[PDB]
């Protein structure tokens, strides 16, 4: 199952 990576961290700055 997907693991929290730098793309997830970065994506959570949008909206």
């Amino acid at each position, epitope marked *: 199952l997907q693991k*929290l990576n730098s793309w997830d*961290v970065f*994506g*959570n700055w949008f909206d």
Partner: antibody
Amino acid sequence: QVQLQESGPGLVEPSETLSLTCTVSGGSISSSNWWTWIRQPPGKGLEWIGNIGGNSGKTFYNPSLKSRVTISKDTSKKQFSLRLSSVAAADTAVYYCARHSSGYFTLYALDSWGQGVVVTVSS
Amino acid sequence: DIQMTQSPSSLSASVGDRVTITCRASQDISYYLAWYQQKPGKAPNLLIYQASTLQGGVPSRFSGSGSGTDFTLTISSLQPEDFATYYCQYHNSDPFTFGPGTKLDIRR
């Protein structure tokens, strides 16, 4: 800055669903934070349960619980929530909400915590 | 994924001491290690993150070091209110594993 207030029942019977809610002040739910749930069974250490991205809504769950855990958020009510279904005696624990601060590409840590709710699973 | 161990599991130290406790990760976690203090009956308090960054509001006598697998928390000028359980944590990816905790008692 951010302060967290937890709410929920102290007693749940086995096979029922446990729901907890955390109310946030000093910041929006919709933010780069990861809103988090942690528990501590009696006599044991701390166990991360899961989180939700304040802006993206992406959720991550501890593999020992993921089929029974759901984390959700409501920005207009300044809250985020935990649902633990099919509770058993082993889910007896103190449950905490927390704020996991973020950088741009890596995370910081759990810098703000609710006060804890003591949850007992029993008939 | 990540297994976290701490050593010693408990110790006593005297007021004025400079005490070091350790944490080890089963895999390289770079510097993404945090340290918490937990008082009996209370939520934990963050002391250190990124292995050596002191959190705002924490007393200057707490410090951390290490990178990779081996880390340490050092409490200088130990104070009587510093009794607690201390936990390390991998704080950059799931399942954000906490160590088992180290219980510190004050000797008198």
